Amino acid sequence: GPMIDLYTAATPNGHKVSIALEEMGLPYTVHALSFDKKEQKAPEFLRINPNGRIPAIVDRSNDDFAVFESGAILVYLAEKTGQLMPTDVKGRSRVIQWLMFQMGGVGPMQGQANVFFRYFPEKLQGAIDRYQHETRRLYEVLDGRLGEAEYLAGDYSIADIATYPWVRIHDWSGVAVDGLDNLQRWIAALEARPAVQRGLLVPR
Template sequence: MSHGKQFTLYTHKRGPNGWKVAMILEELGMTYESIYLDFEKGEHKAPEHTKHNPNGRTPTIIDHKNNDYTLWESDAILLYLVERYDPEHKISVADAGEKFHQLQWLFFQASGQGPYFGEAVHSMRYHSEQLPSAQERYNNEVKRVFGVLESVLSKQEWLVGGKVTIADLSFTPWISRSYGFDLATEFPASADWNSKIRERTSAKKIQKMHDAVNAA
């Protein structure tokens, strides 16, 4: 089967993790086709997708130039992309010790930022009931995560390696949401860091794509 693009990306119009993968593909200059699964129709749980991703969530990639190599879980995808397609380490690190620090931040993003930020938004905007105790819990966790980032970014420009890497880029799509406090006031170093990432060509392109598909 011939593919015009190197990657197929199964994703969601609003889901931050899919946009995170798309941003790294843009950073690396890779060609890809995004397939936006309709969650309301259950397309993410349908056999056409679960044959690639048994977890039935997004994102999922297929690398057609690597024997249709298939991978899911967004931060695992980021690591695959830089290990295979970033030999010059433009957005990754080469030093063995720094690689573990990069991995440390990716684990923190996946286990700390993603779940709590997602639940914070759900409890405020989408839950069938307004539960102040749940909102308070998740908003406090959002602030805790920003506090961790702030403690490091107030002392250095980037999370690892003295340059922007996938460690930094993995956080940004989740920070586009409002959590009921002013980021620049409470966490100024984190706000500056996020703003610098959003000025990158890849981030600007992804934002335009995001706005376009969600306006349709």
């Protein structure tokens, strides 16, 4: 079968990896973990990702080598296929920089907006405001960069793939993109890519 096993769920972080696999044309096997049944905390899965979160992959071509953390999976797959990250020092670093910005900024902060605005047992408007405002600030950083280049690292790369599934759900998080015309251009460009469309449907 496929050489990549993908452990995932219908979430922004899972969609990063299914989008990348679809863009790269790599076959994969989907393991859709049920958070309802706490399958992401099963010790059989903890052997693959000790953090007990999705996504994770196992590369069957590499002696069943596990890779956890969406950003690390994106780097691993880009380096395996030679796609979606340049090989030169500056070009690869620009991808890694914007990927790290997503991994330490956009994902964590927008995820906390979702917690306080949608999930938390009571409404704490000061915490909601903190994370919605911070996410907007991060979106403004993105927008400025997207006036310098068509995609975050220049050419389209894994940095865009990491960032887009989060920006796509800004309405759920209560964070606006109005006034960020470069970000909106990039949203439209990403949305029009067939591989993005396919990756957003994994898992069903």
